[PDB]
Design a protein around this ligand. Structure first.
Ligand SMILES: CC(C)c1[nH]nc2c(NCc3ccccc3-c3ccccc3)nc(SC3CCNCC3)nc12
Lengths: 256, 292
C-alpha cells in the first residue's frame, strides 16, 4: 500500500522534473544530433564503469533540465554530460566512480577543477532536485504485472526505454510513465503477442489507445534502430545479460 | 553566511559538524551542518540528504531550510530542536518515560517514517541519536545522510547499513535485497528501548548482534522465515535458541504494545508490519500528544 503511494508520487513528480519540450530551438550553438551523440557516449560510459541503467536515465534528465535554462556552446556539452553523470552516480550508485576517472574518459578535454565546478553549477541550476522519476522506475513497476515474468520482455522494454533517451525529438514530448508503457507493450507484443494488461490500465489510467502516439514513434525507432547513427545501445543489449534481445525482429505492424 | 551568529558546536552525526546558530536579521535559531569539500566534490551523503529532504516536508521530519555554498564550504540550514531521544532516555533512566509519551513518540515516528516510505525513501539509520525532540512534545526524524531513494521492486543497495544495535536480521544474514522493513526493525528496537530505557540488542560484532536477536526471538527456521537457512551469511552451525516469552522481553508492556512490537520484529521481512499498518494498530486507539 506504500507501492500504490509511490506510483502516485512519481506521477506527480515526473510532471515537475520535466524539461521544456522545444528547448533545443533556443540553444544557439547545439542541436538534437549533438545531444544524441553525448547520450550514446554516456551509454558507453555506463558500460565501462558498470553503472546502473537508472544512473544513465537520471543523468539525461539532469542534462535536459540544465539545457532547458542554460545556453551551452558545443565545446562545453561533454562537461555538462560528464558532471551530470557524476552527480547521478553519487545519488544512485553504491560505488560512484571517482572524479579523476570521469576526467580520464574525457581524455583530459577538461580538468578536475572544471568537472567539480560544473557539478556545483548543475546542482545550483537543478536546485539540488536530483530525485527525478525515470522511464526505468516506471518499467520496473510495470514488470510486476507480467503473466508470467519473461526475462526477454524485461530486457527488450529496457532496451526500447534506452532508445528513447537518444532522440529528443519526439520522446521529450512524452512523460517517462508513458514511454515506459509504450516500451512494455511493444516488448510484450514482440516476444509473446500479448498486449498492455488490464492490471496496468487500472494502475496507470493509460488505455492502449492513449499510448498509441508514443507507441508508433517507438515502433519506428525500433524498426530503424540498426541504421541509426548512435549504436551503443544495440551493442550493450547483445551481451547475454540482456538475453541478446537487440538481435530480435521488430514486428512490422501492431494491429492498432 | 554573514547573517548567522554561531552560538555553540552541537556535535557531529553521520557526516559534517553541526552548529547552533542565530539568524541576526530574523532572530530565528537554526542548526547549521558544515561540510568541507577537501576533493571528490559534494559528498553523496549531502546530495542524497538535500534532494530527499526537499521531497520530505512533514511535521515529524526535520525541515531543511536552506543550502549555502561558500568557497570550499557547504551549509545545510535546518530547523533546530534542543534535544535528541537518546539524552532524554538517559535523563529518564531512573524515572521511566511515561507510557502515553512512549505512545505519542512511537506514533509520531511511524507517521514520519510512513511518509518517507510512501515517498520511496529508506532512512537506514533510525536510532535515538537521529530522532530529535522539542518542548511541545514533538519528535522528528533527522540525519538522512545515509538515506536512499528506492525502487519498486528494490535493487541490491549498500550492505552493512544501519548502526549495529538497530540493524535488521536480513542485513546481518546478507540478503541481496532489503527495503522498508529495515526501518520498521530499527523502530521496533527503539520502541522497547523507550519502554525499558536499555538497548534491546547491544551487540559488539555482527555475529554477537545476530545471537542477541536469536536468544530473544529464537533462532529462525525454514518455517518462521522461509529462505533463511540458505541466506549468504547463514551458518547451519548457529545455536537453536527457543523463543523467549515477551512479558519477560518488555515487562512494562500491555497486550497491545506486545502485539505491535512482535509484528515490528517479525523475522520474515515480507510479513513484518508496515508503518501505515502499524499506525492503525489498536495500541494507538487512545493516543495523545503529552509533554516531556
Ligand atoms: C541538523 C538538524 C537535523 C538539527 N536540528 N537540531 C539538532 C540538534 N539539537 C540537539 C542539541 C542542541 C543544542 C545543544 C545540544 C544538543 C544535543 C547534542 C547532543 C545530544 C543531544 C542534544 N542536534 C543535531 S546534532 C546530533 C549529534 C549526534 N546525534 C544527536 C544530535 N542536529 C540538529
Amino acid at each position: 500500500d506504500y507501492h500504490e503511494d509511490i506510483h502516485t508520487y512519481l506521477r506527480e513528480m515526473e510532471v515537475k522534473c520535466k524539461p521544456k519540450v522545444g528547448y533545443m530551438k533556443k540553444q544557439p550553438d547545439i542541436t538534437n544530433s549533438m545531444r544524441a551523440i553525448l547520450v550514446d557516449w554516456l551509454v558507453e560510459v555506463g558500460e565501462e564503469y558498470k553503472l546502473q541503467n537508472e544512473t544513465l536515465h537520471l543523468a539525461v534528465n539532469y542534462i535536459d533540465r540544465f539545457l532547458s535554462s542554460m545556453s551551452v556552446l558545443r565545446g562545453k556539452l561533454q562537461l555538462v554530460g560528464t558532471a551530470a553523470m557524476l552527480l547521478a552516480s553519487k545519488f544512485e550508485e553504491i560505488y560512484p566512480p571517482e572524479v579523476a576517472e570521469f576526467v580520464y574518459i574525457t581524455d583530459d578535454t577538461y580538468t578536475k577543477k572544471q568537472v567539480l565546478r560544473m557539478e556545483h553549477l548543475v546542482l545550483k541550476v537543478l536546485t539540488f532536485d536530483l530525485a527525478a522519476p525515470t522511464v526505468n522506475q516506471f518499467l520496473t513497476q510495470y514488470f510486476l504485472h507480467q503473466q508470467p515474468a519473461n526475462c526477454k520482455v524485461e530486457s527488450l522494454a529496457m532496451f526500447l526505454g534506452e532508445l528513447s533517451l537518444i532522440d529528443a525529438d519526439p520522446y521529450l514530448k512524452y512523460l517517462p510513465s508513458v514511454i515506459a508503457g509504450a516500451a512494455f507493450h511493444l516488448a510484450l507484443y514482440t516476444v509473446t503477442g500479448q498486449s498492455w494488461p488490464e492490471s496496468l490500465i487500472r494502475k496507470t489510467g493509460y488505455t492502449l489507445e492513449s499510448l498509441k502516439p508514443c507507441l508508433m514513434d517507438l515502433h519506428q525507432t525500433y524498426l530503424k534502430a540498426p541504421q541509426h547513427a548512435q549504436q551503443s545501445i544495440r551493442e550493450k543489449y547483445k551481451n547475454s545479460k540482456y538475453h541478446g534481445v537487440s538481435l530480435l525482429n521488430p514486428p512490422e505492424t501492431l494491429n492498432l | 553566511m554573514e547573517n548567522f551568529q554561531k552560538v555553540e558546536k552541537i556535535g557531529e552525526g553521520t557526516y559534517g559538524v553541526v552548529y547552533k546558530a542565530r539568524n541576526k536579521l530574523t532572530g530565528e535559531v537554526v542548526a547549521l551542518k558544515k561540510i568541507r569539500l577537501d576533493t571528490e566534490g559534494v559528498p553523496s551523503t549531502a546530495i542524497r540528504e538535500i534532494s530527499l529532504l526537499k521531497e520530505l516536508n512533514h511535521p515529524n521530519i526535520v525541515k531543511l531550510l536552506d543550502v549555502i555554498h561558500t568557497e570550499n564550504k557547504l551549509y545545510l540550514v535546518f530547523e533546530f530542536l534542543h534535544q535528541d531521544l537518546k539524552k532524554f532516555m538517559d535523563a529518564s533512566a531512573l524515572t521511566g518515560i511515561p507510557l502515553p509519551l512512549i505512545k505519542s513518540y512511537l506514533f509520531q515516528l511511524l507517521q514520519g517514517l510512513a511518509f518517507c516510505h510512501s515517498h520511496r525513501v529508506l532512512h537506514r539509520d533510525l536510532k535515538p541519536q537521529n530522532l530529535l525532540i522539542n518542548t511541545e512534545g514533538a519528535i522528528k526524524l533527522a540525519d538522512f545522510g545515509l538515506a536512499r531513494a528506492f525502487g519498486v521492486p528494490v535493487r541490491t543497495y549498500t550492505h552493512e547499513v544501519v548502526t549495529l544495535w538497530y540493524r535488521a536480521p536480513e542485513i546481518l544474514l546478507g540478503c541481496k535485497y532489503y527495503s522498508t522493513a529495515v526501518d520498521i526493525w530499527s523502530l521496533g528496537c527503539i520502541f522497547a528501548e523507550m519502554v525499558t530505557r536499555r538497548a534491546l540488542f547491544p551487540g559488539d560484532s555482527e555475529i554477537d548482534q545476530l545471537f542477541r536477536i536469536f536468544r530473544t526471538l529464537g533462532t529462525p527456521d525454514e518455517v518462521v522465515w522461509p529462505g533463511v537457512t540458505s541466506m549468504p551469511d547463514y551458518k547451519p552451525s548457529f545455536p537453536k535458541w527457543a523463543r523467549q516469552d515477551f512479558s519477560k522481553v518488555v515487562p512494562p508492556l500491555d497486550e497491545d504494545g506486545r502485539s505491535l512490537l512482535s509484528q515490528m520484529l517479525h523475522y520474515d521481512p515480507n510479513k513484518r508490519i508496515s508503518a501505515k499498518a502499524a499506525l492503525a494498530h489498536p495500541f494507538f486507539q487512545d493516543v495523545t500528544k503529552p509533554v516531556p
